[PDB]
């Protein structure tokens, strides 16, 4: 049955080249299978590539975008001029070379590089991986990427038009658990968005809900809000979404269980990976993706803060009783 040249077993002969690009990415792009800045940049790239898709434009005669077609790489020259795509150039070039070297389509390569990057981060689910997207793309229309200064209504309209309900917008945001910013406030380069930028866990949902207390750098940056402690950056769209009535209750159910957040994230990401394609036209190669080490820490309210410091926004569900740490307030180092 399907034994790939190097003896691994797989569902289908189209999955065998993906064991080679797996080794190239882990050794080179991920520097020895690490969960550091390349993983974070790839997670931003899969969303900015997949979200250039608009049924609204199609419906009014315009090209609405091919979705998760690898257009951000193939037409990087037009797409990396978009406001939202700053700081992605060096990662787009690294990906272009791996894709030209193994003969895989750019849309498939981005989805693959996302599932492999997440396997290096403790706590991550095994994301579905499908191969078969055509390498031909057209440039994404501008203005389809949500910005950090947008209102929650604007973000829900855009995501909604792409096909996501408010609940799936909160689920998709589990990726800000492995995250930092470099261009919203350059004085505090790589400031994490939660206290564990290398662990895919619930902390992001807990910490954006705490009262904004600290200005982390010398001045405020683009769409920056006050954060709960030294070194953490809080962006305006994440603060608004945690608190708005349309999304506040789903953001609250995401704080207590890494298992529920993970399943929810995996399901939204699987949907987002096929925007612009018919998943029944693709071949399933999920089994090429390895397991992530498990995360054994339980959700906590960091540094001595208590439930009295989180701004409860869901008016029907009471807050989960989460553990507290007997700590002095943390100060976060920049994410690696
Ligand atoms: C509600 C929409 C969202 C907005 C407005 C948004 C906005 C941003 C912004 C402005 C940054 C900081 C970029 C920088 O200056 O370096 C950021 C970082 C990041 N975002 Fe989002 N984001 C959203 C949704 C998502 C989604 C759905 C994913 C992916 C599944 C994602 C993954 C990331 C990651 C991993 C980073 C960290 C990158 C790094 O550390 O270099 N974001 N996001
Ligand atoms: C996918 O399409 C892109 C073109 O859009 C191809 O990329 C080019 O590949 C050649 C050599 O094959 C390079 O010299 C070019 O610089 C690449 N162009 C871009 C824009 O990156 C790529 O080869 C295609 N891949 C496959 C397997 O069809
Ligand atoms: Ca695209
Ligand atoms: Ca985290």
From Swiss-Prot:
The keyword Magnesium does not apply. It comes from the Eukaryota. It is an enzyme of class 1 (oxidoreductase). Heme b binds at residue 176. The record marks 44 as: Transition state stabilizer. Its main location: secreted. Keywords: Calcium, Disulfide bond, Glycoprotein, Heme, Hydrogen peroxide, Iron, Metal-binding, Oxidoreductase, Peroxidase, Pyrrolidone carboxylic acid, Secreted, Signal. Ca(2+) 1 binds at residues 49, 67, 69, 71. It catalyses: 2 a phenolic donor + H2O2 = 2 a phenolic radical donor + 2 H2O. Binds 2 calcium ions per subunit. GO terms for biological process: cellular response to oxidative stress; hydrogen peroxide catabolic process; response to reactive oxygen species. This is Peroxidase. The lineage of its organism: Eukaryota, Fungi, Dikarya, Basidiomycota, Agaricomycotina.
């Amino acid at each position: 049955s399907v034994t790939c040249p190097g003896g691994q077993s797989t569902s289908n002969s189209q999955c065998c080249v993906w064991f080679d690009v797996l080794d190239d990415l882990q050794t080179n792009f991920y520097q020895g299978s690490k969960c550091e800045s390349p993983v974070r940049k790839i997670l931003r790239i899969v969303f900015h590539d997949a979200i250039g898709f608009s049924p609204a434009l199609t419906a009014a005669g315009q090209f609405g975008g091919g979705g998760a077609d690898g257009s951000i790489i193939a037409h990087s020259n037009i797409e990396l001029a978009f406001p939202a795509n700053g700081g992605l150039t060096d990662t787009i070039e690294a990906l272009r070379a791996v894709g030209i070297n193994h003969g895989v389509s750019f849309g498939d390569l981005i989805q693959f590089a996302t599932a492999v990057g997440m396997s290096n981060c403790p706590g991550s689910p095994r994301l579905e991986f499908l191969t078969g997207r055509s390498n031909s793309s057209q440039p994404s229309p501008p203005s389809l990427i949500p910005g950090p200064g947008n209102t929650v209504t604007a973000i829900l309209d855009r995501m909604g038009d792409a096909g996501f309900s408010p609940d799936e917008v909160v689920d998709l945001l589990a990726a800000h658990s492995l995250a930092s910013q470099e261009g919203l406030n350059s004085a505090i380069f790589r400031s994490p968005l939660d206290s564990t930028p290398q662990v895919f866990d619930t902390q992001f949902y807990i910490e954006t809900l705490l009262k904004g207390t600290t200005q982390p750098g010398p001045s405020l940056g683009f769409a920056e809000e006050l954060s709960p402690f030294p070194g953490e950056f809080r962006m305006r769209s994440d603060a608004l979404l945690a608190r708005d009535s349309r999304t506040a209750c789903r953001w609250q159910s995401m704080t207590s269980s890494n298992e529920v957040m993970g399943q929810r994230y995996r399901a939204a990401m699987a949907k987002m990976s096929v925007l612009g394609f018919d998943r029944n036209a693709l071949t399933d190669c999920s089994d090429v993706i390895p397991s992530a080490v498990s995360n054994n820490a339980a959700p906590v309210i960091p540094g001595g803060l208590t439930v009295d410091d989180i701004e409860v926004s869901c008016p029907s569900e009471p807050f989960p009783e989460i553990a507290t740490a007997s700590g002095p307030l943390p100060s976060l180092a920049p994410a690696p």
